[PDB]
Amino acid sequence: TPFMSNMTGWTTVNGTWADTIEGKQGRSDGDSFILSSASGSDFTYESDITIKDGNGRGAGALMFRSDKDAKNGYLANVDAKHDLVKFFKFENGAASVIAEYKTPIDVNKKYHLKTEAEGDRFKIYLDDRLVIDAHDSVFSEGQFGLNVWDATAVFQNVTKES
Ligand SMILES: OC[C@H]1O[C@](O)(CO)[C@@H](O)[C@@H]1O
Numbered sequence: 338t339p340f341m342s343n344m345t346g347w348t349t350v351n352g353t354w355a356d357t358i359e360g361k362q363g364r365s366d367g368d369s370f371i372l373s374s375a376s377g378s379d380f381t382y383e384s385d386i387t388i389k390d391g392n393g394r395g396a397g398a399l400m401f402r403s404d405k406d407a408k409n410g411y412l413a414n415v416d417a418k419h420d421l422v423k424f425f426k427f428e429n430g431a432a433s434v435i436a437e438y439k440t441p442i443d444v445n446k447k448y449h450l451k452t453e454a455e456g457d458r459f460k461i462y463l464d465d466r467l468v469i470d471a472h473d474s475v476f477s478e479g480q481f482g483l484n485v486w487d488a489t490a491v492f493q494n495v496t497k498e499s
């Protein structure tokens with residue numbers, strides 16, 4: 338098992354998801370999603386994320402407090418195309434952004450993305466540097482997942498602690 342995670346029940350919502358020696362690979366034009374059967378309310382959730390060459394060289398994301406369809410929930414991402422770390426939400430099937438931090442995000446560079454969620458408060462860390470501290474009260478609990486946007490991206494050491 339080349340994909341390292343402490344979570345299981347990984348079930349594709351859409352896009353294409355496969356395990357490689359670099360970890361779990363997602364690939365789509367636009368947004369796509371894979372959900373774990375694992376669920377949570379307050380937690381730390383993290384992954385190594387690498388944007389590969391291909392598609393639009395866009396983004397890879399943690400997803401959390403997600404509904405069963407990935408139509409509602411929170412994401413934190415690294416976006417190579419836009420040079421952004423975004424904290425955002427889907428609500429009623431569409432995305433809107435809560436906070437975003439500007440920094441160069443390079444293709445083929447491994448980033449460690451960490452989210453700490455506690456009640457309505459979220460702290461997002463990029464390679465251990467705190468970059469976003471935000472509030473949003475829309476979702477309190479749900480499934481963990483992963484997302485890519487206009488990208489091929491690879492996720493490794495995907496872990497939850499609570
Ligand atoms: O940064 C990429 C992300 O940006 C969004 O357009 C939200 O602004 C999402 O659809 C996509 O996953």
Ligand code: NA
Pocket residue numbers: 416417418419420441442443444
């Ligand atoms: Na970039």
